[PDB]
Amino acid sequence: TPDIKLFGKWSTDDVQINDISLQDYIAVKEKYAKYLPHSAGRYAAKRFRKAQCPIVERLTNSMMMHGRNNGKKLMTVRIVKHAFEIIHLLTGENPLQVLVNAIINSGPREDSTRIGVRRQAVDVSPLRRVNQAIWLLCTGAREAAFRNIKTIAECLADELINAAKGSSNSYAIKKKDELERVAKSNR
Amino acid sequence: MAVQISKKRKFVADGIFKAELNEFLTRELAEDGYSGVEVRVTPTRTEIIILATRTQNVLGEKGRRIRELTAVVQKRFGFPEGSVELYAEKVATRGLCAIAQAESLRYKLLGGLAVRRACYGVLRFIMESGAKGCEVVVSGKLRGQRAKSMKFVDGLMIHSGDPVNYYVDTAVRHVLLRQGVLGIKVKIMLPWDPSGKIGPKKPLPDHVSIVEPKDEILPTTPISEQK
Amino acid sequence: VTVKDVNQQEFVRALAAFLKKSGKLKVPEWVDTVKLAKHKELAPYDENWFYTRAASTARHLYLRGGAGVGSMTKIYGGRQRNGVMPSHFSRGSKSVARRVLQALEGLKMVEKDQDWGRKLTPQGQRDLDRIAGQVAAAKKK
């Protein structure tokens, strides 16, 4: 620990990416362990510099969207913080493993391109699998807590939980299944 | 005031003064080859210098014109009597001052001459006096009722970059005739006088130049001669 | 301990009770019908707002001498929403800040400075340091 940063409280060892493709594109442990999801981060400089970014800072960045949320990142770090504690209560598992499983369960691996309403099926790159997973997971929390009495932190944890426990009750998994079904039709 | 004007207003006011004096002396000494003023505020006095090509015409008979000029410059700008002091001077190599050639061509055209003949005469003069290049444009109703433009270029001429703030002299002059105005534009390139003041120093940026030495001998024998 | 070594949001909270524990620091009469700045919409929630603002003004005078009313009203100035037109920055209320500084002088806590302005007395630095020590020893910082 004196040389192992957790998150303040969440240990980042004993977290297993159980995919062979999506690893090397999910920067959780052993070199990307950091105290906070907030760095200067000149990650948008070259083509693939983005995969070296910690995944929690890839979610913190994507969560601040739709107009009156742009640049409000210190508001977007406390959201992830309050959500990880909700996740640890509702389940009991290390809240980073739930995030990794949710990212794995919601990135589509087949998709379709408009060509020549003609579409043709193609297979998704791993980086695009991670990007689509993050975007889908954030949009679900956004649309779930837009006029509810529930808070953006309860619904983000709801989304992550229903995604890691593949249930089709999360917005991200309904959307994945549609893209892969529409792509299977156009096969 | 008890506390005088601030530095910003002071410098802006100096510039406006110089511009108005230059306009005034332009509108008057045109027929005498006026080519610029140099306000040199010296201890105890405000000295103004007028370069020109015909200095006798500037001062006149015993200096009546020059004294009238001192008089008006002292009346209009509010100077204490005895301060404004004015000098005339002759410009060397008049063929390289654009304003002089522009006004010369304007009066040569105002007196009746084939516009091509006049433009080619001034081109000849400007290039003969020593100049990397010149360019004279005349725009207006030349030979008809529809306007046109006639451009006479010669030698080298640059249009782009910083080296154009020096290395070129530009002059634009209107000339009114029996039917509408004509526009005269003269541009000249100064021929890089090193350490001199007929052109600029500091040669063109893309002008790397190499020197070649000698006195190196290949025949050699290891002799150590003493002194 | 010093005043700078402790969380200031609890320091203001303790000093407000200190001020509203003595009976001194006579408040104005218009305390219940005043908006506190041009750019506000309602009266302050907290009924005993004058003691909190006196504590705030005192802790502000501890940190910079010679403040005077025209700066207290800049220290409490914020944003004004002009309805349909864009928002701008706005000053606090001179009457409130002036009455607060006059009520602090009525406690020997502050004095009018040598250059024009207001400043803490030696007796005010002591009352702020004692409350700082009390706060530090309370929360075991």
Binding site: - | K202, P203, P205, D206, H207, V208, S209, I210, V211 | -
Partner: protein
């Protein structure tokens, strides 16, 4: 990108080499000073570009001879 030198740089470097062939070496920070002292380049960026092409030419003249 760019990094394609211009004829004003290449001709200057070729002349500098063809006259002072024996003063020029293989390192850049010395060729820079040599070309600074033997010629008159009216800029510092141009000086660096000329001295950087001189080095790339010298690295070739040590092999088979160039044709300019």
């Amino acid at each position: 990108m760019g990094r394609v030198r211009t004829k004003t740089v290449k001709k200057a470097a070729r002349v500098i080499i063809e006259k002072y062939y024996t003063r020029l070496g293989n390192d850049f920070h010395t060729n820079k000073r040599v070309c600074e002292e033997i010629a008159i380049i009216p800029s510092k960026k141009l000086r660096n570009k000329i001295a950087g092409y001189v080095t790339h030419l010298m690295k070739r003249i040590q092999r088979g001879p160039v044709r300019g």
